[PDB]
Ligand binder design. Structure first.
Ligand SMILES: Oc1cccc(-c2cccc([C@]34CCOC[C@H]3C4)n2)c1
Length: 860
């Protein structure tokens, strides 16, 4: 129909790639992915359109609960009914549930409307005014993030009673429209020739080839003969490997590196030896190579799409049999693996085995004992699966069969264990499928917390149709907030050729599953397009005229009908719960830094004061490492809160949306330490001593009794950020990248560098901040040591979750961030968390680094 053609054009525009481009590849793997995932996502959409009204609230407006709630005090609340300007202000308890609040609003409505009411509180949900956020379910009001925030800020919760018929009307409005093992011969290939090779004519060309299973070599690497540098080198030679065809594991990858020698790296290319349908590849392959910025096994197994300029390697995969050869089916593997010798060992060896499995590099004899005792591992140490997988001989099909027999009856593992198993160190497809099965129990909150890392893991996948893609799509189609961030994490990397195909296909499938959300996301893309054009203008103008001039010109551009329409009434890409209603042009500006980022302000009558929100649009900087740093800080805040420690952190939004483009959430009523320390005259904060400036500023924002709370907020957040910057090795910290809220809360901005990047970043204590902590007194050991206590408690909590941080950072290596590209970068985190030590030893070490920081602070 004409509606299908329109939806196809809308998807093409949204994802940034024409769908016709998928068809043009004439790739059966692409075609099957598109068909199967379209069916899967359309089935999820059919299920969603018939959800009950409360299930539909769970889909569109998933609950935002405090970390303590997951798994007393008087409170004033303002409640109105939908489409009525009239509101009721009443007193409830923080311990009361939404149902009691709703029953109270209904009794009030019945008295005011003089009618014995027809409505039960069970037919309603409470919307947060002017936000895509609702309060519902059997949780006390203090457990909702919105109420918890209102309590901390002192503000009165403003809620709207929304009836079930109104929620159903939303559901309806948003509907989609109407045998290998016999082949003993060594594996070999013919290296035919190269095309479009660029190198120094004085040198020679060589092709290094290796067979890998993840990062691990399946045998020794082999090199071609050296042939003189030219545009079309010709080898026409056989490269034989030290591994039988029968012993190639299912996920074996053949990896190449073309280089020049008198070493000068030129290009690299990888390919899976078996296709997506489990068939062993035969015949000619033209491999369009990727430039080398020598073998790169973690590199993509798809060819470079720039076939016009890429160097190409032509190879021949020999016909090993007169008929096609497929990897054996699971039943054949299980039959082979079912047979073995069950380990019988001494009581002393059982103690030595327990010692190593509970301990991750091992010696050869330690690996032999783990393998020998693999049945004992399964039955009594199931969480040591990763250790057993690492000792398995992936180059011996009998050993692999025996490992897979145990894997297929392995008990499900905790979420923490499964995150480790997604690492590229575990490349087998059954292992990958096992990890996904153990991750199905992830709550939507945990999935959201690790979504960024799960998206990065897609870059290690060998095939398009995989369990991780299906998992992410199914969870995204069942939770609109997950769907929102899955979309943006994929869309923001469409300018990266190695992932544009895979990411483009996932975004298309998602859109098939929610036509309405596709349109919501298109409205966000239109605002982003306008912001880029506006920012390009500001960049040009800022070099030619004065700031008030560029600001008025920026304002005139925004007041154009096309800009006013595109920039208004959208869901925020930083947070789909936040609605960006009317752009407040008068309040919009830009910042003086290099990229001239735009500062965009919004207001919303319906949301009142909560509708006053800002976004910063920045183009020219890669925001991926900032987002990762902020998400790690937010995880620290969750882990602390789960132990009842609230360090008053400010986990503001940061989201890459495109090529060196993204948004940052504005924290209103905040200023940089630098601006406050300028100590300007005729201000409430003006000081006799520069050290008095920050405290005088806090006193001016918090007069009388409020000062004590502000100093406390400052102290707790200082402790949180001191521990966060030390653990993450956040460097380049000065007064212009540290901010303070009027509440007293300190937070960090502009996370350009982390993990010591290479130098070990020491713990930092600044004397201007010690002065505030000590309430302006020269000596105040009571307050200072209380602050040290918060630091120690925060640090010991993080250490206890050390493995989670390590597993997440390990998955992030797939992102290709320059400061997270090797083992040295992660060693930084291993050292800061001192995980190879006892808690008493690590606390002793932290105390040494803290005291060293105090003595450095005392020099000021
Ligand atoms: O994470 C980054 C990365 C790069 C630049 C920055 C930045 C620079 C200047 C201002 C800000 C604020 C101002 C107050 O609200 C909080 C954040 C948005 N952030 C933050």
């Amino acid at each position: 129909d004409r509606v299908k053609k329109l939806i196809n054009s809308q998807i093409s525009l949204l994802i940034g790639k024409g769908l016709h481009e998928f068809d043009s590849l004439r790739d059966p793997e692409v075609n099957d992915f598109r068909t199967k995932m379209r069916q899967f996502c359309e089935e999820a959409a059919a299920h969603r359109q018939q959800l009950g009204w409360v299930e539909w609230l769970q889909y569109s407006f998933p609950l935002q609960l405090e970390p303590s709630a997951r798994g007393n005090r008087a409170l004033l609340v303002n409640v109105k009914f939908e489409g009525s300007e009239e509101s009721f202000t009443f007193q409830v308890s923080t311990k009361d549930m939404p149902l009691a609040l709703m029953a109270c609003a209904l009794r009030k409505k019945a008295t005011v409307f003089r009618q014995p009411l027809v409505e039960q509180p069970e037919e309603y949900a409470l919307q947060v005014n002017g936000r895509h956020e609702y309060l519902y379910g059997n949780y006390p009001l203090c457990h909702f993030q919105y109420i918890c925030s209102c309590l901390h800020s002192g503000l009165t919760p403003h809620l709207t009673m929304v009836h079930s018929s109104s929620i159903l009307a939303m559901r309806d409005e948003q509907s989609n429209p109407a045998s290998l093992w016999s082949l003993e011969q060594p594996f070999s290939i013919e290296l035919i020739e190269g095309r479009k090779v660029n190198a120094d004519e004085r040198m020679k060309l060589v092709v290094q080839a290796g067979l890998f299973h993840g990062n691990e070599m399946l045998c020794k690497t082999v090199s071609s003969s050296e042939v003189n540098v030219c545009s079309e080198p010709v080898w026409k030679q056989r490269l034989e490997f030290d591994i039988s065809v029968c012993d190639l594991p299912r996920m074996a990858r053949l990896c190449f590196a073309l280089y020049a020698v008198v070493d000068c790296p030129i290009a690299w290319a990888n390919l899976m030896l078996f296709d997506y349908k489990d068939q062993l590849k035969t015949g000619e392959r033209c491999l369009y190579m990727w430039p080398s910025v020598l073998l790169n096994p973690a590199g993509t197994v798809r060819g470079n799409p720039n076939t016009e300029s890429a160097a190409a390697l032509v190879i021949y995969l020999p016909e090993v049999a007169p008929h096609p050869v497929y990897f054996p089916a699971l039943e054949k593997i299980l039959e082979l693996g079912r047979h073995g010798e069950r380990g019988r060992i001494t009581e002393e060896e059982q103690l030595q085995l327990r010692e190593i499995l509970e301990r991750g590099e091992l010696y050869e004899h330690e690996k032999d004992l783990v393998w020998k005792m693999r049945h004992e591992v399964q039955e009594h140490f199931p969480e040591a699966l990763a250790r057993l997988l690492l000792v398995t001989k992936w180059n011996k099909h009998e050993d692999v069969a025996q490992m897979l027999y145990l894997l297929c009856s392995w008990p499900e593992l905790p979420v923490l264990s499964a995150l480790e198993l997604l690492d590229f160190s575990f490349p087998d497809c059954y292992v990958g499928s096992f990890a996904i099965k153990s991750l199905r129990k992830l709550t939507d909150d945990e999935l959201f917390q690790y979504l960024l890392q799960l998206v990065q893991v897609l870059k290690y996948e060998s095939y398009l149709d995989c369990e991780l893609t299906k998992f992410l799509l199914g969870r995204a189609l069942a939770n609109r907030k997950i769907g929102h961030f899955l979309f943006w994490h994929l869309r923001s990397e469409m300018h990266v050729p190695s992932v544009a195909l895979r990411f483009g296909l996932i975004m298309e499938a998602y859109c098939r599953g929610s036509t309405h959300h596709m349109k919501v996301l298109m409205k966000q893309g239109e605002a982003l397009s306008k912001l880029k054009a506006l920012n390009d203008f500001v960049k040009v103008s800022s070099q030619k005229t004065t700031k008030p001039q560029t600001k008025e010109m920026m304002h005139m551009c925004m007041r154009q009908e096309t800009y006013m329409e595109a920039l208004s009434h959208l869901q925020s890409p930083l947070d789909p719960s936040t609605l960006l209603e009317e752009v407040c042009v008068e309040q919009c500006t830009f910042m003086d830094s290099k990229m001239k980022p735009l500062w965009i302000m919004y207001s919303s009558e319906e949301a009142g004061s909560a509708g006053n929100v800002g976004i910063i649009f920045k183009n020219g900087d890669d925001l991926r490492q900032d987002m990762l740093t902020l998400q790690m800080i937010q995880l620290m805040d969750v882990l602390w809160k789960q132990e009842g420690l609230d360090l008053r952190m400010t986990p503001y939004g940061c989201l890459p949306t495109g090529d060196r483009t993204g948004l940052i959430e504005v924290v209103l009523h905040s200023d940089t330490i630098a601006n406050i320390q300028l100590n300007k005259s005729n201000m409430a904060a003006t000081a006799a001593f520069n050290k008095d400036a920050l405290l005088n500023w806090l006193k001016s924002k918090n007069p009388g009794e409020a000062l004590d709370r502000a100093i406390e907020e400052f102290t707790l957040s200082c402790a949180g950020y001191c521990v966060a910057t030390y653990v993450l090795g956040i460097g380049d910290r000065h007064s212009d990248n540290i901010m303070i809220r009027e509440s007293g809360q300190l937070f960090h901005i502009d996370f350009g560098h982390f993990l010591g990047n290479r130098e070990r970043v020491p713990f930092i204590l600044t004397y201007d901040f010690v002065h505030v902590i000590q309430q302006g007194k020269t000596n105040n050991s009571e307050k200072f040591e209380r602050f040290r206590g918060y630091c120690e408690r925060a640090y010991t909590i993080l250490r206890r979750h050390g493995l989670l941080f390590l597993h997440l950072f390990a998955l992030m290596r797939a992102a290709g961030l320059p400061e997270l590209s090797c083992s040295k970068d992660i060693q930084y985190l291993k050292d800061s968390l001192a995980l190879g030590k006892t808690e008493e030893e690590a606390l002793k070490h932290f105390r040494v680094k803290f005291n060293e920081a105090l003595r450095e602070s005392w020099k000021t």
